[PDB]
Write a protein that binds this ligand. Structure first.
Ligand SMILES: [Mg+2]
Ligand SMILES: [Mg+2]
Ligand SMILES: [Mg+2]
Ligand SMILES: [Mg+2]
Ligand SMILES: [Mg+2]
Ligand SMILES: [Mg+2]
Ligand SMILES: [Mg+2]
Ligand SMILES: [Mg+2]
Ligand SMILES: [Mg+2]
Ligand SMILES: [Mg+2]
Ligand SMILES: [Mg+2]
Ligand SMILES: [Mg+2]
Ligand SMILES: [Mg+2]
Ligand SMILES: [Mg+2]
Ligand SMILES: [Mg+2]
Ligand SMILES: [Mg+2]
Ligand SMILES: [Mg+2]
Ligand SMILES: [Mg+2]
Ligand SMILES: [Mg+2]
Ligand SMILES: [Mg+2]
Ligand SMILES: [Mg+2]
Ligand SMILES: [Mg+2]
Ligand SMILES: [Mg+2]
Ligand SMILES: [Mg+2]
Ligand SMILES: [Mg+2]
Ligand SMILES: [Mg+2]
Ligand SMILES: [Mg+2]
Ligand SMILES: [Mg+2]
Ligand SMILES: [Mg+2]
Ligand SMILES: [Mg+2]
Ligand SMILES: [Mg+2]
Ligand SMILES: [Mg+2]
Ligand SMILES: [Mg+2]
Ligand SMILES: [Mg+2]
Ligand SMILES: [Mg+2]
Ligand SMILES: [Mg+2]
Ligand SMILES: [Mg+2]
Ligand SMILES: [Mg+2]
Ligand SMILES: [Mg+2]
Ligand SMILES: [Mg+2]
Ligand SMILES: [Mg+2]
Ligand SMILES: [Mg+2]
Ligand SMILES: [Mg+2]
Ligand SMILES: [Mg+2]
Ligand SMILES: [Mg+2]
Ligand SMILES: [Mg+2]
Ligand SMILES: [Mg+2]
Ligand SMILES: [Mg+2]
Ligand SMILES: [Mg+2]
Ligand SMILES: [Mg+2]
Ligand SMILES: [Mg+2]
Ligand SMILES: [Mg+2]
Ligand SMILES: [Mg+2]
Ligand SMILES: [Mg+2]
Ligand SMILES: [Mg+2]
Ligand SMILES: [Mg+2]
Ligand SMILES: [Mg+2]
Ligand SMILES: [Mg+2]
Ligand SMILES: [Mg+2]
Ligand SMILES: [Mg+2]
Ligand SMILES: [Mg+2]
Ligand SMILES: [Mg+2]
Ligand SMILES: [Mg+2]
Ligand SMILES: [Mg+2]
Lengths: 64, 84, 51, 54, 96
RNA sequence: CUUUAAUGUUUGAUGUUCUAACGUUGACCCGUAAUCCGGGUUGCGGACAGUGUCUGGUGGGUAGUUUGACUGGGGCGGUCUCCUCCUAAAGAGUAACGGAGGAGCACGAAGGUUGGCUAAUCCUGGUCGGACAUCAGGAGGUUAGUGCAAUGGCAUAAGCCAGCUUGACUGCGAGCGUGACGGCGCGAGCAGGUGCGAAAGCAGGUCAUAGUGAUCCGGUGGUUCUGAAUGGAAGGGCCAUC
RNA sequence: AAUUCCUUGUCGGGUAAGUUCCGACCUGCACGAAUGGCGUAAUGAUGGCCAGGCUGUCUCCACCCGAGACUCAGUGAAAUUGAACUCGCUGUGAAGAUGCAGUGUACCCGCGGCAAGACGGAAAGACCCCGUGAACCUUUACUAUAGCUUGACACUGAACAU
RNA sequence: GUUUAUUAAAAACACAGCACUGUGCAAACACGAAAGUGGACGUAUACGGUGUGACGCCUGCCCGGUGCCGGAAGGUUAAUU
RNA sequence: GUAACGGGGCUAAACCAUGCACCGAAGCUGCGGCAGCGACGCUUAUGCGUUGUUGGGUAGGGGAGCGUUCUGUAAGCCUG
RNA sequence: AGGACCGAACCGACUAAUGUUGAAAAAUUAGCGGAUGACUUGUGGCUGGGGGUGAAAGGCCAAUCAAACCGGGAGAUAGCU
RNA sequence: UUUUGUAUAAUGGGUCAGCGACUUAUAUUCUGUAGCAAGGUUAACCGAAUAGGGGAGCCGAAGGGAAACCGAGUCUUAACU
């Protein structure tokens, strides 16, 4: 029957305009006092899923 | 004398190689902000239009071509960026 | 480790706070500093508070 | 396996031409006999050489 | 999503955001669909009747996409800057 | 105002009597020819015992499962992440239960800047005071120092003092380097607002490389972004952070 | 020593010679008092050792009587089997060759025998390792739970005194 | 005497005897969601459990640990309010 | 069981040096044939003068087919 | 008198040889143990699968037992062949 | 067959004949091909029923943002070179 969306991947990835996926950078949930502010500033903006993991996320998330 | 004896070793530790060394060699043409050499301590020094980061990484501050030269009284090695 | 974590709250009333580590035993005196406050975009006195 | 071994004896790698033993103050023939006796205890072919200016 | 037991991508990356329920009842209309209504008035239920938007939509916005070549009177919708300029160039009116 | 008489008054508790619930595997009568059962009379116990729900304890009596990997076969022993040198074959990278050592931090200053200074060791002379304390001169040349390992650096000092200080800033970031990826690092320059300096200028931590853990789930503070009829709020999101 | 490793402990007895046996010593790796200690008459298809008698158990086999094996007539299986025109040696080789190389030998085919090889036949090794395999068993492994037990509330009420 | 029917008959199990321990009778304990039944138409010279195993001479010290029994003062402690 | 040239055997039929022949593979060439790709003819239906190269192959990827039963064409066609 | 003695039936199964595609999926031959008892045996009944029963071996429960057999979940799953 | 590697003395098969292993359903993506083309297409169902009707709905033509919201821009930020 209908393929089922991997709900975790649906929560963590969003689809864009040409087919890429935007995700949130890791390393920003806790242990933040010891992380330099430059590092956190770079980790705030959303990033793009790389080519290698494109296949994984696409298979996980067919109704994206 | 049947099977074997035994005895542990105290070593078997090491660290991830850092990929230091000259990235762009002499004669190459770099864009501004290109890392020319990653190093531990100023083995190479910052010449013209070349900046030295905190980890003594030399990066070109201006577009152009790399140029190594021995310079100064201590015969040290300076990386300069000829304007191109 | 031996250093605890403290937050320097702004005295400009923004509620903004920096965070840092402090040696409680060797420097029992509180810590005050002039640190930039993005909310009011001015350098203001930041004083120590528990995390 | 299980690590390296323990040091058991010390050697000195010998390459051809290395002048192992030297002797002075004795007659030449007695030096030859002494060097023959010594070389008989070594696992390397040897030869008898003399001093020269250069 | 399996990767050999290594923590998969959709688990080592953090979740983010929430889903907006009002975005499921808001919709968009192109300038081309403006002439596809009837009577020249672009009411919300007029668009629904012309099947430009779904039945349970309750908000709508006209955007600079395509072109409009007839006088219309966009009533009750929100209009972008470029769409407003294009409609007023076409001789249309932009009610509240 | 850490006391009791209070008109007792509403009430827990305890204790003592009662009988009417309930128990009776006491006796007798009846259905009934029936040591089951039920009904009656009676004796005893009696709000106890016992059962239901909730709850703490105990619980291998019973049940479901877990009990890592590498490995010169497995076990035992040792190791598992990070930093430094060698192996490593003059770019990068490169294994072994290969050879050596360290880390799980420290610092409000040991950071920034401005100004200034230059070490180890030995010899000579000198009160206590010597092989080694402080003083003076010389030789020496960085054989010192670098908060902690080793390497590479360091005299313009990155080594040592002193003044003022908070750039151990907020939003970005051309371009690179490094990774399968997650990620990690370097970074001029731009905007705001600061420190030091007469100024040029330097400053988004420490001479550099270790000093650390993703996600989820939650906690705290902002943020009216959303807030299922409407207004709020709960909650959720975003930002900082545990 | 049903315990004792070193160890065939040492001393004595038994034997020509005794790692076993018997009696002792005590240096009990690592006995010990109801997961009993030390003895103990009788009992044992019980374990160890010794002697008399007796013998083909043996020196060392010999002969004989029967049932097969052997031949003839009748009936008539089985495991196994890639195909075979199915030799020895030396070497080579997935490292132990009927089959490769070199070489020697060998007319074709049965019958009775033997069992050295065909890594012979049987049984998807029981030993070993592995599987994020299974089962039963254990416990002060984790999580539960029947049972036992505690209190509250209910069935459950009265009088009185503190 | 019994025992691994079908590789182990034994030094194993049982045994009479001994000890500890539970149990006052609607007994403990066991089978059973319960009724009920066994124990027993028995009653502490009885019944259950555990260990040792005729008989003779005996059975020494330790209660720290783990259990079991007794205690209720104090500490910590659930539901409920 | 010779059994440390493969054997025969060899005093050169051994070793060294100089040479010149010859043997020697599915290598190269000759003849004939098929095919893939590319350029070029430029035809464009797969003929497309021609030409140059290419064609060992496991896991695997791509292209093209054979054959079997059944359905339509088929109340056709073949067949006592 | 006796869980007495010797020894047939009856019950067992200690040694040896045979057999080990057997005459037999545990027997035969020669010896062997108990043989008035905790014996043996016929007939009928009762106890059932995490359960029975067990003078205890993890033994027996229809040639099957560290959890019978039959049907179903079921084409369990098999990173293995 | 499995392997770095088999004549291997590693596995399988005595032989023949018949049977025996990448399928089906529904979704999703890519390719080829056919129709239509900023459009494409219908599903249940109705139907003289492979027609026709049915456009409910789905995909696409607009993206950015967690979101309100903005919109060929949008987000970040007080604002972007
Ligand atoms: Mg957060
Ligand atoms: Mg290593
Ligand atoms: Mg893991
Ligand atoms: Mg519609
Ligand atoms: Mg268990
Ligand atoms: Mg399970
Ligand atoms: Mg292992
Ligand atoms: Mg271990
Ligand atoms: Mg290198
Ligand atoms: Mg190299
Ligand atoms: Mg410093
Ligand atoms: Mg400094
Ligand atoms: Mg340092
Ligand atoms: Mg509301
Ligand atoms: Mg809120
Ligand atoms: Mg002895
Ligand atoms: Mg003697
Ligand atoms: Mg003796
Ligand atoms: Mg003795
Ligand atoms: Mg004992
Ligand atoms: Mg003992
Ligand atoms: Mg005892
Ligand atoms: Mg005993
Ligand atoms: Mg007996
Ligand atoms: Mg005798
Ligand atoms: Mg015959
Ligand atoms: Mg051979
Ligand atoms: Mg042979
Ligand atoms: Mg024969
Ligand atoms: Mg044989
Ligand atoms: Mg034979
Ligand atoms: Mg065999
Ligand atoms: Mg096997
Ligand atoms: Mg038996
Ligand atoms: Mg037997
Ligand atoms: Mg006993
Ligand atoms: Mg005792
Ligand atoms: Mg005690
Ligand atoms: Mg006590
Ligand atoms: Mg107690
Ligand atoms: Mg010989
Ligand atoms: Mg040829
Ligand atoms: Mg080919
Ligand atoms: Mg047909
Ligand atoms: Mg008798
Ligand atoms: Mg028997
Ligand atoms: Mg008999
Ligand atoms: Mg008899
Ligand atoms: Mg007898
Ligand atoms: Mg008898
Ligand atoms: Mg009887
Ligand atoms: Mg069952
Ligand atoms: Mg056993
Ligand atoms: Mg059976
Ligand atoms: Mg089971
Ligand atoms: Mg199932
Ligand atoms: Mg089944
Ligand atoms: Mg199956
Ligand atoms: Mg192998
Ligand atoms: Mg071969
Ligand atoms: Mg063979
Ligand atoms: Mg074979
Ligand atoms: Mg096979
Ligand atoms: Mg076979």
């Amino acid at each position: 029957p209908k393929i089922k969306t991997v709900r975790g991947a649906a929560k963590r990835f969003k689809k864009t305009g040409k087919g890429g996926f935007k995700h949130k950078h890791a390393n920003l949930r806790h242990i933040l006092t010891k992380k330099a502010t430059k590092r956190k500033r770079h980790l705030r903006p959303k990033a793009m899923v790389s080519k290698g993991d494109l296949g994984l996320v696409i298979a996980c998330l067919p109704y994206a | 004398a049947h099977k074997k004896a035994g005895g542990s070793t105290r070593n078997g530790r090491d660290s991830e190689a850092k990929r230091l060394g000259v990235k762009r060699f002499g004669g190459e043409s770099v864009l501004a902000g290109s890392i020319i050499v990653r190093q531990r301590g100023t083995k190479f020094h910052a010449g013209a239009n070349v900046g030295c980061g905190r980890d003594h990484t030399l990066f070109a501050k201006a577009d152009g071509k790399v140029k190594f030269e021995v310079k100064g009284p201590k015969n040290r090695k300076f990386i300069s960026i000829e304007a191109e | 480790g031996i250093r605890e974590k403290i937050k320097l709250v702004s005295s400009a009333g923004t509620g903004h706070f920096y965070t840092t580590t402090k040696n409680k035993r060797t420097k029992p005196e509180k810590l005050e500093l002039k640190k930039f406050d993005p909310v009011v975009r001015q350098h203001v006195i930041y004083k120590e508070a528990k995390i | 396996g299980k690590g390296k071994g323990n040091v058991e004896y010390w050697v000195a790698l010998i390459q051809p031409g290395k002048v192992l033993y030297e002797m002075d103050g004795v007659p030449e023939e007695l030096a030859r006999e002494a060097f023959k006796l010594a070389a008989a205890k070594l696992p390397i072919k040897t030869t008898f050489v003399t001093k020269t200016v250069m | 999503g399996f990767e050999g037991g290594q923590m998969p991508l959709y688990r080592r990356l953090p979740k983010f955001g929430f889903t907006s329920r009002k975005a499921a009842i808001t919709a968009e209309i192109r300038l081309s669909d403006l002439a596809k209504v009837e009577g020249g008035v672009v009411d919300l239920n007029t668009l629904k009747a012309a099947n430009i938007i779904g039945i349970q939509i309750e908000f709508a916005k006209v955007i600079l996409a395509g072109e409009v070549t007839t006088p219309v009177t966009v009533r009750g919708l929100r209009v972008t800057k470029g769409a407003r300029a294009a409609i007023e160039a076409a001789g249309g009116k932009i009610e509240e």
